[PDB]
Design a protein around this nucleic acid. Sequence first.
RNA 1: GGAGAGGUA
Lengths: 69, 1316
Amino acid sequence: GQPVVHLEHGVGRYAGMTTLEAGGITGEYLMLTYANDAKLYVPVSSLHLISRYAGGAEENAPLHKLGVA
Amino acid sequence: VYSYTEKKRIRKDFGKRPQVLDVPYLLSIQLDSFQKFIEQDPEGQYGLEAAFRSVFPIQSYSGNSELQYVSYRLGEPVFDVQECQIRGVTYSAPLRVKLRLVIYEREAPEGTVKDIKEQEVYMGEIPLMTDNGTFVINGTERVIVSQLHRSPGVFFDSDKGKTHSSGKVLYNARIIPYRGSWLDFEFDPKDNLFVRIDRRRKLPATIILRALNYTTEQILDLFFEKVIFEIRDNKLQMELVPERLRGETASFDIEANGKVYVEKGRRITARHIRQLEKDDVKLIEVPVEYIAGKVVAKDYIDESTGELICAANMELSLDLLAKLSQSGHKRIETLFTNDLDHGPYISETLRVDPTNDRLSALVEIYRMMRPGEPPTREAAESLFENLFFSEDRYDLSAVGRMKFNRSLLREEIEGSGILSKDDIIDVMKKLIDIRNGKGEVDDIDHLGNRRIRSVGEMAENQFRVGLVRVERAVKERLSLGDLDTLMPQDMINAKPISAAVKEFFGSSQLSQFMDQNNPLSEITHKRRISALGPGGLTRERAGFEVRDVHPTHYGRVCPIETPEGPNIGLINSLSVYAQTNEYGFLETPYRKVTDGVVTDEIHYLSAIEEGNYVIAQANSNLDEEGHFVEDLVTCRSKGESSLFSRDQVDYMDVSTQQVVSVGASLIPFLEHDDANRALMGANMQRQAVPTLRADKPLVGTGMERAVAVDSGVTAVAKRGGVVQYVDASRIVIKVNEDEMYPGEAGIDIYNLTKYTRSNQNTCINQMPCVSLGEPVERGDVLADGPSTDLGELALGQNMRVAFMPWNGYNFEDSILVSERVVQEDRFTTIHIQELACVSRDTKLGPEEITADIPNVGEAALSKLDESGIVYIGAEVTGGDILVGKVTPKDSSLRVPNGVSGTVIDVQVFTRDGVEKDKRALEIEEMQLKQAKKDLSEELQILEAGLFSRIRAVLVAGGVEAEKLDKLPRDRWLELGLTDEEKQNQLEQLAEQYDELKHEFEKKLEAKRRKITQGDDLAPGVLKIVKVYLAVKRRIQPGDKMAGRHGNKGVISKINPIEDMPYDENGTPVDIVLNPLGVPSRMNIGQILETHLGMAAKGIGDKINAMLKQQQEVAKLREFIQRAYDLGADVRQKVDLSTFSDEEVMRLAENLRKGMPIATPVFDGAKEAEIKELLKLGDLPTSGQIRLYDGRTGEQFERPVTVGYMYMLKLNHLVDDKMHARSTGSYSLVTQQPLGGKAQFGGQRFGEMEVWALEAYGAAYTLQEMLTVKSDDVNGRTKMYKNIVDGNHQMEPGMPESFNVLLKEIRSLGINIELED
RNA sequence: GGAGAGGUA
């Protein structure tokens, strides 16, 4: 649940590790839940774009949308 | 053995065959199909999942990225069924699919994941299936019949000498995929072989053979045998096969082993082959002339020069043999041919073949398929390959593969969904074999060749074809670059799928309106089996062969039930016990017959399997052991009947009544009437109007309760219980203790649909058929729907009938009816009409519904309210005002002329964002209060049930009945109790109580939202008001009633009772039919019915007399028991002694209007038992009694037949037809009177009538009729003036339509005109 | 006004 920043897209909430098939190759991914429950699976190999939240608002961070009279 | 409720009225039953299998659930074939269409199948071989997995994934052309499928889901329906019926929107469900776009890394090798994203994209709404099966598109509930299309696969057909006038048949073969291009092979009159694709230009087949990279010698090897000649020391000592010697004649001296086996001019006897094989000779010296006109199998070339001496498929000549011999050739292979065994059909086509190589064959194929477009070396190959071997564009379903392998004597019942070289090769081999005689042509009308198809498959196909468009869109999108920022939402579009499915459901040749003026109507309509539609033959180009009943219809399709007229044999109805095969064929049950014992175990046989075994029919007299008393038993062996031994049988029918439809199953004494008249009786039975209060038919066939309960009209209890409270509107049942679930006890509750218009303007409502404190059992009826009585079908009324002429008033088929039928008022029928009025928005501003209108007296306005809307319950008459509407510059709606009735319901709808007038707010508030009070009552009833349960669980282990009532229910849940599961149950019930509280508290708000919100509407319409009139059509001379045996008639007169014939006993008859009808149209069933019904009524009357004076149960039990006795070994065997001695009283009460009688269609009650039953009553056994005339009073000689008959009043009312027009509107393009009763149109003086007038000398009248009464404007204007002025004269002029024709012609280049 | 579906004689 720890907020995570991926510079490509934005701010999501870390939601664990998963295994996904990608055309005959089973690979491990870290799944982030962006706004409107849009899952994004980063290959564990591409861990370097996954940075920790820096705003000091881990529990008050935003959640970017992936993509009188 | 008899249910308590059943004991209210138990039908005396005839018939002797012990029923072994009850009828299955009639409405099965529908709910299962749609059920399979929508399901989460892991196998991914049903419905949506199969389609999704098929179309997906999708790969870009590069393809740097692809889009694949993951899973799907259906959201909750937005609105319930009743709401959709009210507003008139579809009862659908959203579809939400999780798609997954992946992106590779382009520079990285093939197969890698740069990134990956996904979302749940919405797409489309799919209409849902109601509990009954019907769909609701726009509050216009319709039904989808099933199709009977020929199955995909292969078929060897033959034209039966119907072409070329040569008497020579021409066998053709067809391959029909489930989705793709067809294929045909045909035999020319000249024994050539022609391929044809999709009915395009013809082609030699060997072309397509070459298309498979097949050369000449390969083909010849595949399709013929070799004969080897040996150039040797002495002139071609040829090797020989004795088997090739059948059916020839020795042309020379056949000699070997120094033995002249045969000489020239001799026919090759079998014994010649006998001596040959005995000598075991193989090589025979043959003269050179034997090779005079042969053809070489392969090519032969000179080894040294490397030059072909004789290319393959080349005739034989002496000098050619010399060239072989000098070439040193030793083995010479030629084709083994023949005229009756092996015709050289391939060789001829090969000689016809202009092409020799793969490329040119493909090129010319491409040219044939697409005229012009100079091909390329790639276009043809791509075309062919994607055409016949790309699964995506060509597909034999699993059914196709199974049937194909079946036809070719293969072993695997599973294979690929596309074709293969061997497939075509074997097809052509089989066709050639058929040409040679082996194997036989295959008919089409065989039930083993045509397949049913219910809704689900068609819906899936429509979904797929819709999906294809968005697939193409996304593919062209991904072919484009700029993929770094795409989402699986922009490229996906809902509109294509929505259109593709909505268009089909709302508007298709199979989703048709529902006839609803009967339970029977709905049932029989739902079971319909059509043969028209997409992929089906056309109504008006069908020969006799389709319409005729193939022998295989036995037990699978009712042969006697069909809509006559323009379409017979195409709207076939399903048989009763028929089932559907896993694939979609028709199966029927059969009792397995062991060695000599008829078991009760059953197997469902398909059409094809039946052709092998032997089946004895239903009525075969066995005796308790399946040991047939007889020895030459009647059996249908294979497309014919015969008498076979007592041991050879393999199967027996289930019941006599497995051959007919449910619809015809209700006709008593069917086995005596003619076929066509029974068909007519059935079709008319489908059209009965429900009466005011139904009456059981005295003489049923016993199929009544099944039809009633299986239909959705009646409210059938689901879990036996006890009536806790009854009302005209709702019912509540305290559930039985055992049927109750452990948690969430609750109590059962039902609500009743009151008067609501049917599809045919006939009101429908339900009435309870039980009182308080009445125990009930699971599956028992509770609320009588239309034309039902105590949970059994009851359409018409049973009445006293007599057969005799009477002053000609029943001359042809007119039916004379006494006055009691109307006085007692047992045929009046209620009807409901809906009238609408809109407020368009037009120039000169819009218009409104103000109560004030110009140039009208207050008299008409007296009935409207201040708003401009009539009050509910007002009794309007013809030509009134319902809603006052204005001319923006008087469009007030008015009652249609002639119609009377009462307003019962008003509704209104407004565009959103528009203020609402007084009445609209009033109705909104009233609905608010209604819903509030309704939910309050429901909630408190449920809470009462819950606290009753809580009290029940506290009766043991600490029961203090005082303490229960000391402090009220508010504080009961918290009471202490011994520690066990009881405490868990207490907590469970309290939790359910709080949950009920919350559920109600939210549901109230939900309903408030639904009510208060605005209404969507079509553009331009500001608001719409609807009003419901109720009418009671009673009866008139002219109406059309009928009996059940196709003996229809038109009521003609209403005599007063005093003129009616009356018996010596003083009871006058109520209907007088014409005896003359019976003999010509042989339907004795009505006469037998009359006799039997008279007997039943006599029994009922005797019981009523016994009851009138007080008679203790002692006599009643005796008499009723004896009545239920006197069967010819009937299977009823009902015992009175077991009854509570008061159920006896109630049963007698229910029987005082007759004793119901059952009669299975082909197990009916013969004459003798009717005679005995009559004699149980004091009626004359002869059936005919003497009568006395109403007017004269004297007796009629010639004792007359009288009795009772069940009769229906059909839905062709005289008031609906009688129509007239003096001078009304006028068509626009042509100035003629409009047509149809809806408009105030006039009749059509047709061409034949013009001929007829010409036949008489009548000229003036014709001229006037087609000049001044219809067309010539000025003529009719001045004619109107003249007629007003009392001067009958006319001025012809010229018809306008002729000028129309003149202008139309002149629009073409034709100059046409009138001379001087 | 025109299409399509169903239905009656």
